[PDB]
């Protein structure tokens, strides 16, 4: 009778690793098909409840397990930084993520992984 027992619960298609730092120890977050919101809010797929992370910081959209995730910043206060090539990602502008790609949300360094590597 549970809500989740009715549904097709789709397995994770990727992983976001967060490196250890002033905010705490390393952590892995499962990423799913669709919109993975990165943000401070408790409901976010990648919930990073640090005061420097925007309530809705960024979004990693995964359309297919054979297509590159699409990263975009949601007009976060402290920005989203990519390194391919290095630059602050302007709100709305999509960035396709490669396996092992490194990104910063505010001062939190993260690395995206496929699951077939």
């Amino acid at each position: 009778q549970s809500s989740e027992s009715l549904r097709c619960n789709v397995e994770p298609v990727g992983r976001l690793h967060i490196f250890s730092g002033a905010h705490g120890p390393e952590k892995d977050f499962p990423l799913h098909l669709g919109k993975n919101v990165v943000g401070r809010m408790p409901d976010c797929s990648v919930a990073l409840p640090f005061p420097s992370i925007s309530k809705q910081h960024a979004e990693i959209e995964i359309l297919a397990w054979d297509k590159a995730p699409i990263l975009r910043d949601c007009g976060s206060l402290n920005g989203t930084q990519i390194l391919r090539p290095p630059k602050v990602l302007s709100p709305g502008v999509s960035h396709r993520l490669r396996d092992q790609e490194l990104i910063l949300f505010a001062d939190l360094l993260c690395q995206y992984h496929r699951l077939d590597v």
Binding site: P51, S52, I53, S54, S76, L77, N78, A106, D107
Partner: peptide, 8 residues
């Protein structure tokens, strides 16, 4: 709460 600014 409001997002904190990072000081550099």
């Amino acid at each position: 709460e409001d997002t904190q600014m990072i000081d550099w």
